[PDB]
Amino acid sequence: MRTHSLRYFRLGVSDPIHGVPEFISVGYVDSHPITTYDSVTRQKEPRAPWMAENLAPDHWERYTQLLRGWQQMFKVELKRLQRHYNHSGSHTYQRMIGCELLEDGSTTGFLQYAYDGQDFLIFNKDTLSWLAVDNVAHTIKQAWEANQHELLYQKNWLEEECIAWLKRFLEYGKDTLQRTEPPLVRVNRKETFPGVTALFCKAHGFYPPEIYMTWMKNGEEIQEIDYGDILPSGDGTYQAWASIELDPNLYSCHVEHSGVHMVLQV
């Protein structure tokens, strides 16, 4: 197994312009959406076929009721936050919780809040304490840190429950999440502005999206490499690239994907 992850996001919007839910929730395994809920449908629904086929209807019924509750919690906290800040009008409140299971056997877990899309409160499950970015966050910090049992509960959830959900969903979606589609890599040479040769090394067709690409001179490290984003091709695979300039030493593109290494010599 490669590194895998489970993440749940919440998004609250006070005073939303028509057509924007006041509350949206979405879970992910790796890059794949698995679950969704919002304040318009007021239902938690699967977003992936392997989630729908493996989780009985009483699962979605139970989490429908909790998200309804959690939407009301988010509405009320946003109101208090705005009161602390003395903010009128429309503002956003966000939460991310999740965990990772890396190849190493070692795990991670995290829990974070943002207000207006900036860091607000960061939980440390190893010291069981919240980090506050300012004095309003410091007030909430004191409230949450005074409930000792609640911090122990979060630590337990990140370290045991979250990892066990992830292992469950990996088995459900293993045919999607554990597969490998290797990349197609090509190198393109071209003289650009007079006397400037750009080399592009370009990859597509691959999955998982994680991929390593770099340029090397004579077999040792490279100058300034330009990196293209890993982008979804819309068919379940990904694409990316890396480029350098030379002018006229000989170069090679090096690609790493799912434990297979590739060299393209220019």
């Epitope: 009301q72 509960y153 337990n156 045991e160 429950e161």
Partner: antibody, heavy 109, light 114 residues
């Protein structure tokens, strides 16, 4: 989850110690609660454990081993007052409470 | 904290009745349990927050109304001798908060006779 197990009844002598066991086998774990319910009255919250160890509140203590799926409520210096039922309850992976059938504790003078 | 009525009720078979429960603790979640000899509490219906309800373990022969944030009624549609029991209303700050305890009302003893 499926099962919570705790003895039906327990008798101990006033001034001594008693340990009420609770084994749980659930699907996921999010906490173990102990409640006290006097005869003909409502249950009231005694303790909460979610990580391993022993929490002590006065003459009462509650223990949890998450790997043995196991908790006990410990009562020291028993008093007649302590006669009541003791409810064991576990939150499962979907935050539902699975309740044990309770342990009636009898104090002999 | 939690107020529940009535404490005791005799009913004839086929009669209806409503149990009332009110909490003024600004709690979001309320529950209706029945307690029967030799078994754990069984959750009939619950309300994870104002504006929503769902069945519990033994909903048949009951329904509920979360009237407002404070109040959670339980109705016996057509009292059966099997519904002879002690009924507990309970509330808690939220649902899905791991360490939140329940706060119970005093109980309603109901006996249904032919």
């Amino acid at each position: 989850g499926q099962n919570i197990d705790q003895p039906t009844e327990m008798t101990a002598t006033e001034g001594a110690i008693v340990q009420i066991n609770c084994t749980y086998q659930t699907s996921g774990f999010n906490g173990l609660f102990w409640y006290q319910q006097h005869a003909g009255e409502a249950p009231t919250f005694l303790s909460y454990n979610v990580l391993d160890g022993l929490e002590e509140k006065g003459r009462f203590s509650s223990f949890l081993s998450r790997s043995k799926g196991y908790s006990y409520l410990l009562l020291k210096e028993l008093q007649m007052k302590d006669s009541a039922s003791y409810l064991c309850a576990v939150k499962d992976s979907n935050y539902q409470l699975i309740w044990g059938a309770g342990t009636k504790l009898i104090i002999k003078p | 904290g939690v107020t529940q009525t009535p404490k005791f009720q005799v009913l004839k078979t086929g009669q209806s009745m409503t149990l009332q429960c009110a909490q003024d603790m600004n709690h979001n979640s309320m529950y209706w349990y029945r307690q029967d000899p030799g078994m754990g509490l069984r959750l009939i219906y619950y309300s994870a927050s104002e504006g929503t309800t769902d069945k519990g373990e033994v909903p048949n022969g009951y329904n509920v109304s979360r009237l407002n944030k404070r109040e959670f009624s339980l109705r016996l549609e057509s009292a059966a001798p099997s519904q002879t029991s002690v009924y507990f209303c309970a509330s808690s700050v939220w649902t899905g908060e791991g360490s939140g305890e329940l706060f119970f009302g005093e109980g309603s003893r109901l006996t249904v006779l032919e």
